[PDB]
Write a protein that binds this ligand. Structure first.
Ligand SMILES: CC(=O)N[C@@H]1[C@@H](O)[C@H](O)[C@@H](CO)O[C@@H]1O
Ligand SMILES: CC(=O)N[C@@H]1[C@@H](O)[C@H](O)[C@@H](CO)O[C@H]1O
Length: 214
């Protein structure tokens, strides 16, 4: 409970250096990524209830063999069942044998698919809770400032956020969150081992999984 106005933290060199990738990046040299000082790598696993990212397994194994902390994210499509997507997401992680990820499972919500604020937010909650039920692990929500302020409601504030807001040292005013565990500050980074623009992030220690229901 707030007793005064809270605000998003600014970047800090002591936070975890991270990146996030998907099939869009193709083959990645994680030894190079590691040598660049990167500490965390989020990997796209699934999208909707039908798409599997072909590079999820090689990215997971490639990053882990270099000692990088890893997490997975799911690109949400609100026109598909929430629990259905949660199961599709986790089923794929098990299919590729990714059973030692270090970071919270991420819900990438950035499109409405025509769904209203209350309903879209409820779908997100159902997804998050189903993922928690299935894995016994914790979750995090990825979205961008304007989306949080106009397309979702405060109930999602009960979950930590990995917020996207490029070109700034501090994420903008947010009606749902006043603190972040993740901050995607650039989509054009030059990272060794990664071809083309790379998503750049800062993560706090709270991005790590540190509990289980089992
Ligand atoms: C967590 C993250 O940055 N996901 C991005 C998503 O925002 C973007 O829309 C998509 C297509 O460019 O690529 C990645 O999935
Ligand atoms: C490199 C690695 O193995 N990842 C660990 C992660 O599992 C753990 O949750 C975190 C706690 O601070 O420390 C990281 O180094």
């Amino acid at each position: 409970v707030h007793h005064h106005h809270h605000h998003m933290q600014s970047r800090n060199n002591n936070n975890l250096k991270g990146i996030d990738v998907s099939n869009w990046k193709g083959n990645i040299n994680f030894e190079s990524v590691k040598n660049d000082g990167v500490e965390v790598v989020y990997i796209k696993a699934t999208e909707g209830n039908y798409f599997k990212d072909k590079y999820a397994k090689q990215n997971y194994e490639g990053a882990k063999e270099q000692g990088l902390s890893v997490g997975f994210y799911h690109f949400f499509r609100a026109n598909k069942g929430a629990k259905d997507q949660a199961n599709f997401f986790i089923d794929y992680l098990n299919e590729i044998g990714a059973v030692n990820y270090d970071c919270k499972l991420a819900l990438d919500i950035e499109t409405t698919e025509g769904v209203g604020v209350r309903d879209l937010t409820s779908m997100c909650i159902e997804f998050l809770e189903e993922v928690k039920r299935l894995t016994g692990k914790e979750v995090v929500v990825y979205t961008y400032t304007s989306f949080a302020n106009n397309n979702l409601d405060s109930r999602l504030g009960n979950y930590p956020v990995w917020i996207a807001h490029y070109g700034v040292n501090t994420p903008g005013a947010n009606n749902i969150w006043s603190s972040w565990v993740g901050f995607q500050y650039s989509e054009n980074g030059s990272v060794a081992g990664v071809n083309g623009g790379c998503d750049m992030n800062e993560f706090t220690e709270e991005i790590f999984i540190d509990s289980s229901n089992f």
